[PDB]
Amino acid sequence: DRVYIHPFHLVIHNESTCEQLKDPTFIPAPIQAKTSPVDEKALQDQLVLVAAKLDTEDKLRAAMVGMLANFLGFRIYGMHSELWGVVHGATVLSPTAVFGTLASLYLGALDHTADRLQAILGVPWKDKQCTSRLDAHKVLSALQAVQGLLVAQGRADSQAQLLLSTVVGVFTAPGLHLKQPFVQGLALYTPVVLPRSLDFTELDVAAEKIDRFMQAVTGWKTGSSLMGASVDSTLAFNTYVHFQGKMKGFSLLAEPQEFWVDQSTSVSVPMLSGMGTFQHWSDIQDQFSVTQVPFTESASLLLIQPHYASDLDKVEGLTFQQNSLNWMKKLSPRTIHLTMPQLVLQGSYDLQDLLAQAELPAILHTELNLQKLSNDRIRVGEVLNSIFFELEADEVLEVTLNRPFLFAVYDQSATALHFLGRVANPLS
């Protein structure tokens, strides 16, 4: 039947798919076993290929999971007193990644675990039929679509250069047998999946093995020491995402400028500077200014500066809600000279912490049923999201971000927030 309880009909199973009625397993090679580094340029070529053969229906599904990811992102802010206390390193977040990580857990979940994970993703069910449940395959492929759509815009635009890499590291205990169809499912989300076996009895060394392995294979830094891992841990599900967006007609100024973290304190920071006609709007009631700088026609960097420095947290509350996507319309063109810090940010967080008030720890530790992932004993050490975020260089209103500000990168193709962030200090 047609769906009414939610407007997300394209992400659930259908009649043919549902009620279809002895699963190959394997031990991933040891982490030390030498692997080829990821060819990012070859990965970017794969993602454009995904996007360039998306039918109309597939395009709508991409926009749908974009919306769901966004909503979860806003839920995650609404449930935290100090959200950024959880995030190690730079204060950046990825709704798309977080949604993909939960969707990957759901992929290998059953019974009450699956129900609770589907609940957090934010798509309910009106009965315990098969057709009311989430189609992980459609969700995971749809998330690769929004990645594809973003990077394809970058190619089509002669000026712009967008780059988005997502790699998943599934690290298991020695002897833990992974199910083949689970790995087959992750491959829908991203082409770079790295299942490797790893001894967790020495967490101090295990962390170094991962950091070295991930740094060798990617070339990015992480520094995630499995802070909340135990000796009984037999699984670490880590998502590493890299973003690099070229700023149209911006130059890196040779001389630095002062960035005011406090009323009293400043810090010397390298700054980007650029002229152009950008979308701008002042909210006089709530007291903040939004400035949009396009990467492409449909993908942009939103820059929210509060009118007063003390209202940052207050204005952040107005940024991270459903309303924020309404004021995309209230923008209008302005000739602007923007000056903002060169952002080269690395941050990481555990979802277990992010979604503590949605009782994700309870789901992943009490009465766990991840039998679609593995029949062995699964005890989750960390569910990590590592983010590496770069902004590189190539009458009139002077916009200057020499004090704390919020940012987001948004793609209208799939109506998706790839990154929400906050810059209290542009270095560390």
Residue numbers in the entry: 1 to 21, 30 to 402, 417 to 450
What does the paper say about this structure?
Human blood pressure is mainly controlled by the renin–angiotensin system, which consists of several key components, including renin, angiotensinogen (AGT),3 angiotensin-converting enzyme (ACE), and angiotensin receptors. Renin is a highly specific aspartic protease that cleaves AGT between Leu10 and Val11 to release the N-terminal angiotensin I peptide. Cleavage of AGT by renin is the rate-limiting step of the renin–angiotensin system. To address these questions, here we have solved high-resolution crystal structures of human glycosylated AGT, its encounter complex with renin, AGT cleaved in the reactive center loop, and the spent AGT from which the N-terminal angiotensin peptide has been removed by renin.
